[PDB]
Write a structure and sequence with these properties.
Helix content is about 25%, strand content about 50%. By secondary structure, it is an alpha+beta fold. Helix 1 packs antiparallel against helix 2. The longest helix is centred in the middle third of the chain and has 19 residues. Bound molecules: chloride ion (3 copies). One chloride ion (CL) binds next to loops. It is classed as nucleic acid binding protein.
């Protein structure tokens, strides 16, 4: 298993690692999160999904910037403000911009159709452009389209 590139981002007290990697099952991007409380979690993306994710990020950013401060005091019961879904064979990815007490974050959940092993990262909304730009330049180099 070879590591082709890494990007590290510090966002509102968390860290994120974006690693481009390669093994006999192909090339992919691993995204690892270190929580504000220390909690570790990871998701894995094919390069085609990472390009699709990168495009969604521009759109989630415009939405985020249009919001202004909270509240008023009326959120949707589940907490979700904007949603997308990405598909890669048997893998599904839910992108939900949520708003809780601590603030705004893009929750990204990876599931497998059947299903099976699930996992998520929670990207503070202030970091969406940094994450987007980090994806864009890993993809310039490693993802041909
Ligand atoms: Cl930040
Ligand atoms: Cl694998
Ligand atoms: Cl799959």
């Amino acid at each position: 298993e070879q590591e082709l590139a890494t990007k590290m981002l510090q966002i509102q007290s968390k860290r994120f690692y974006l690693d481009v990697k390669q093994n006999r099952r192909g090339r992919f991007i691993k995204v690892a999160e270190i929580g504000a409380d220390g909690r570790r979690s990871q998701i894995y993306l094919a390069l085609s999904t990472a390009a699709e994710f990168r495009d969604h990020l521009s759109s989630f950013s415009d939405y985020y910037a249009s919001l202004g401060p909270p509240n008023t005091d009326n959120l949707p019961e589940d907490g979700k403000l904007k949603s997308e879904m990405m598909i890669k064979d048997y893998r599904r990815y839910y992108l939900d911009l949520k708003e809780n007490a601590r603030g705004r974050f893009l929750r990204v959940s990876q599931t497998i159709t059947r299903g099976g092993p699930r996992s998520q990262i929670a990207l503070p909304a202030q970091g969406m452009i940094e994450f987007r730009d980090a994806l864009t330049d890993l993809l310039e180099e490693f993802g041909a389209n």
